[PDB]
Design a binder for this molecule. Structure first.
Ligand SMILES: [Mg+2]
Lengths: 143, 178, 154, 99, 221
RNA sequence: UCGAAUCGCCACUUCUCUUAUCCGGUGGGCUGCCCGCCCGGCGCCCAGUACCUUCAUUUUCACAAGAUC
RNA sequence: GGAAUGAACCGCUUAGGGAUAUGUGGCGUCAAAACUUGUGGGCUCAUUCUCGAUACGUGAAAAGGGUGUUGGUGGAUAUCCACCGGCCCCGA
RNA sequence: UCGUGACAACGACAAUGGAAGUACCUUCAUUUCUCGGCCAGACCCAACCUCGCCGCGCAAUUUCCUUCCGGGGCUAACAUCCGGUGGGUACUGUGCGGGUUUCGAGGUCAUGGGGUGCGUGAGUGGGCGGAAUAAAGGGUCGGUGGUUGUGUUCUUCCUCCUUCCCUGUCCGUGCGUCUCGACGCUGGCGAUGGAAAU
């Protein structure tokens, strides 16, 4: 059992796991795909950073109720993501300290995706954009 | 599963007492939607035949009977219905069904459409599975021969409830609206 | 007129029931709008009653008698290999395709999207270079009219 | 038959046609978009000046399905939706998402 | 309709050329009158723009004698003191459909009047509707799912004639002209339709070997 | 002058006819079985499945802050 | 709150308001609900005040007729006779 | 009751009236301005209300199923149907269950919170702390003698041991008389203005 006061406590859906591809449903990056990296120390938002080369979505925070967690997952054992901490977002052109953190994490994420057997198909998959065409039903899909 | 009017066997007797110890035990076959209606019909029959009322009697069994199998059969049902200006009318009819409960349920619906008789004005005298070569109705004997065949014409084909379009393209299944 | 006939040994497909889009062979006829359906080489599909508004007859038939045994029906089906032939029919493949799309996991949906786009691109490339020689499109046909019209003045 | 009650609204969505499909959309956010006749205050009026316009939105949520054909019931926060919206477009968003 | 100089000048400054609202065109051939009117009226109230063509091919259950007598009973009703105020008895098939739809709408409120304004109801297929796009049908009122085969039915055009309509010959003359022009055009461009079909074929064996397999798995190739 | 609501489009759809009807047409053998023959599409993020390639601080939703007219 | 409408019929009986569920009555449009539900049976065709379709509501019908069609009962012969129902038609 | 200037619009439902919003006007009131009695979103605890998935008892599953014959029937048979023979061991009914040594989710713009953070602002919890590890209370098997009832022995139920199988045990926190007051996290808006918000 985990106490609610302890940092490791968290109440999020089992679908949203590190390495899961997600579809962003709201904000300026709506319709794009990104990789979930981790969760903030408390019961806070998740940290998503799709490879900036692929989807062009940088490191930022997102609520779990504004994404759709798909069933395709990429292993993140090699990546660390231990430099992502809440105060880097608390600070509120791009500072170069943010640039180096984004670049370093991106290279590890890209290498981990390539290590996956279907790396080429996954890279193209992360480039795609989701939209609701005239005459389709999202409630009948499976994700 | 589809038919209403399940098959019930009701066993009862008059309550033991002086001036009549060890009363006779009777058996009754009835077709009713539930066992509460089955027991109501049993006491109505007992009252009008043996002069025994439900207040002075008891019910020993209200079991449900089991049928044989899932084959096609011929059933002869002799039935009687009451109406004013005509009294009681008795008739014998033949049906095709799978079980006795289904055949009797067909007979009740048949009497409703063709003679406008409700459930409580109808009494069933018996139901029996008769063989071929002794059914007297041609609307039943026409299904007996082997190599029987017929096509399906004037069909009305409705889509599954999930598809169910409203406006569809004239030369395609494009489903413009809904 | 050209309808397939309802008889003992005729394969049918269910329309709207719980056993939707399933195939079984008619074994008996009871009255005008009820039959008994059974398929012993498939899960579920034991002998049961089916309304005649809920089936569609197929082209395949099997030689059996009315009210036949389950082991007799199983022997007849495998001798004629009727079930395999239905699976090769275009109607069966279309139904199987729709079920595959309903199970898709948004990654195979992307893979199908890529495959369709690749075909559309190559069809466009094939259509051109058959329009340069023997023009057929609206613009390539009008190019010949324009060039000949300008020959006299230029 | 006695009259209408304006604290709840009925919305018909495209491609639902079933109660089981309408149950997927319970809890989703809904907005009605219209325009006024001058520029009033809006969200991010000072951070994003490009957003200033005559456009306005009224938000709501889906509470429960209505009937058996895929109609839903909607409550528009505290107030009620204006009667000039009858027959016009309603946006049904995909958040909050349980999937 | 009829843009004045105010409208043309504004379009000239803004740079706009053409605009077409979203409209559904319904072919009303072999459709039950009452069932089609009820379905269309509800869709009008839901904010739809509908144009219906071939209104002379609507069908009514019963014999022509029965339906003609029914109309003659309706025609008998008029305000005795001033018939120019009384009910008006329109005679064209397209006007009859609009009257039937109007009785299925709340016509004495602004909401119902606006809904009725969104229906056009042509006779035949006019020249301004031919090239707009594909037509649609209503399967719930198609009369081959509705009527038993042995029952007699009336065609609306035949019944509208014999009670006052005097444009049956004009409509059939224009319809026959449309069929010949459409038939001639459709036979043309058979080469480009075949060329596109011969392009989708042989596109395979040019695509990569993996995309063809995915197409085969989903039953598209 | 006007800041506005609407959010697929196509010179492959935009011809016709039937539903007791070869539902793609179409012959033959012995009154239903069997055997042959020929012929909507795109669109959803490399103009295309393939290496390469800018997306940020608009740093957690808000009318798409973008388009069409 | 229902029976379109009605002192008295049906349901229910009343402080100011939300959520949930019902009663009578309903689910083609008007008009909320089967986006015209069933993978349930039968019967019915009604030409000039126009077939039928919510009880109370005589808020309209009788005696007497009709193989129009669909069911029963009792007799002869391997189809005939007599009688009685249902819906529809004349009497109106 | 009438004139004038400005403005608001408005077809024909005679106007007036009720309810609920919205578009423009406000010489009205209250609050805030570097923290806010403003507007949104997500999260936690308690309570209430739902959905999935998995099961149980009863002779309910024998007026039944299956083989081998004798009738009968059809076509060469089979089958529907009636009598016998030996085997028997998803099913039209009825009463109910399932999260804490854990069975998977959802909703409350339709509820209360300080939303564990100060002091009397009383987490009562199988759920929060501490300890302990099958603790008593059930399901089958084989024996064991008393019992209810048919039939001329067997059929229930008991008490008493023997085999396996399942689950979850104990302890603990009142306030110095009473009542009311105390509104977390993230963003938008508000920095004294013909300002925002109600
Ligand atoms: Mg409605």
């Amino acid at each position: 059992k985990v106490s609610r006061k302890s940092p490791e406590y968290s109440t999020v859906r089992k679908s949203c796991k590190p390495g899961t591809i997600a579809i962003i449903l709201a904000g300026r990056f709506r319709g794009r795909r990104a990789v979930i990296l981790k969760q903030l120390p408390k019961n806070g938002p998740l940290v998503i950073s799709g490879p900036m080369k692929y989807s062009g979505v940088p490191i930022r925070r997102i609520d779990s109720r504004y994404i759709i967690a798909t069933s395709t997952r990429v292993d993140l054992t090699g990546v660390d993501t231990s430099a992502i901490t809440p105060e880097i977002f608390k600070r509120e052109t791009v500072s170069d300290e943010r640039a180096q953190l984004q670049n370093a994490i991106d290279t590890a994420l890209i290498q981990a995706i390539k290590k996956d057997p279907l790396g080429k198909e996954m890279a193209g998959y992360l480039h795609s954009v989701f939209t609701i065409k005239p005459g389709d039903a999202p409630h009948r899909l499976k994700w | 599963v589809r038919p209403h009017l399940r098959h019930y066997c009701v066993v009862g007797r008059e309550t033991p007492s002086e001036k009549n110890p060890q009363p006779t035990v009777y058996k009754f076959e009835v077709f009713a939607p539930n066992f509460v209606v089955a027991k109501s019909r049993f006491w109505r029959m007992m009252r009008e035949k043996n002069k025994v009322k439900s207040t002075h009697g008891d019910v020993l069994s209200c079991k449900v009977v089991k049928d044989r199998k899932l084959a096609a059969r011929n059933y002869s049902v002799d039935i009687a219905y009451y109406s004013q200006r005509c009294g009681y009318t008795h008739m014998v009819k033949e049906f095709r069904d799978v079980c006795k409960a289904g055949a009797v349920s067909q007979a009740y619906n048949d009497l409703a459409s063709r003679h406008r008789a409700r459930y409580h004005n109808i009494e069933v005298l018996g139901v029996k599975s008769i063989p071929n070569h002794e059914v007297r109705r041609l609307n039943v004997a026409q299904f007996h021969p082997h190599n029987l065949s017929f096509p399906l014409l004037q069909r009305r084909v409705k889509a599954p409830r999930k598809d169910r379009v409203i406006f569809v393209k004239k030369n395609s299944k494009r489903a413009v609206v809904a | 007129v050209k309808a397939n006939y309802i008889r003992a040994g005729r394969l049918v497909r269910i329309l709207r029931g719980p056993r939707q889009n399933r195939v079984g062979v008619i074994v008996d006829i009871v009255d005008a709008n009820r039959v008994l359906v059974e398929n012993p080489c498939e899960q579920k599909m034991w002998r049961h009653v089916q309304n005649l508004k809920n089936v569609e007859p197929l082209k395949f038939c099997v030689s059996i008698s009315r009210n036949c045994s389950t082991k007799a029906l199983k022997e007849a089906l495998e001798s004629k290999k009727v079930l395999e032939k239905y699976a090769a029919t275009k109607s069966a493949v279309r139904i199987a395709a729709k079920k595959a799309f309903a199970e898709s996991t948004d990654f195979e949906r992307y893979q199908l999207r890529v495959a369709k786009r690749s075909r559309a691109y190559w069809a466009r490339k094939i259509f051109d270079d058959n329009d340069k020689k023997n023009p057929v499109s609206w613009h390539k046909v009008a190019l010949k009219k324009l060039l000949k019209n300008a020959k006299k003045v230029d | 038959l006695h009259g209408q009650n304006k604290n709840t609204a009925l919305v018909r969505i495209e491609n639902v046609n079933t109660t089981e499909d309408a149950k997927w959309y319970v809890g989703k956010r809904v907005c009605y978009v219209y325009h006024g006749y001058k520029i009033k205050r809006c969200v991010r009026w000072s951070k994003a000046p490009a957003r200033r316009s005559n456009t306005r939105a009224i938000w709501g949520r889906i509470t429960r399905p209505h009937g058996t054909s895929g109609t839903v019931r909607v409550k528009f926060n505290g107030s009620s939706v204006p009667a000039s919206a009858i027959g016009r477009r309603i946006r049904v968003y995909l958040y909050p998402s349980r999937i | 309709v009829l843009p004045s100089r105010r409208s043309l000048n504004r379009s000239s400054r803004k740079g706009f050329k053409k605009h077409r609202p979203d409209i559904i065109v319904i072919d009303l051939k072999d459709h039950v009158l009452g069932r089609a009117a009820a379905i269309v009226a509800k869709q009008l109230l839901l904010g739809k723009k509908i144009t219906v063509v071939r209104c002379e091919k609507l069908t009514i259950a019963g014999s022509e004698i029965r339906n003609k007598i029914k109309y003659l009973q309706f025609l008998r009703k008029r305000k005795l003191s001033n018939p120019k105020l009384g009910p008006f008895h329109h005679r064209s098939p397209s006007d009859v459909f609009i009257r039937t739809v109007r009785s299925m709408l709340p016509r004495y409120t602004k909401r119902g009047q606006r809904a009725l304004r969104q229906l056009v109801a042509y006779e035949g297929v006019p020249v301004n509707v031919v090239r707009t796009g594909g037509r649609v049908v209503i399967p719930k009122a198609q009369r081959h799912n509705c009527y038993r085969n042995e029952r007699r039915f009336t065609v609306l055009g035949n019944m509208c004639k014999h009670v006052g309509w005097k444009y049956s010959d004009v409509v059939e003359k224009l319809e026959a002209a449309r069929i010949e022009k459409s038939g001639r055009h459709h036979k043309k461009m058979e080469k480009v339709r075949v060329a596109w079909k011969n392009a989708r074929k042989e596109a395979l064996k040019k695509m990569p070997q993996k995309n063809v397999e995915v197409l085969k798995k989903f039953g598209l190739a």
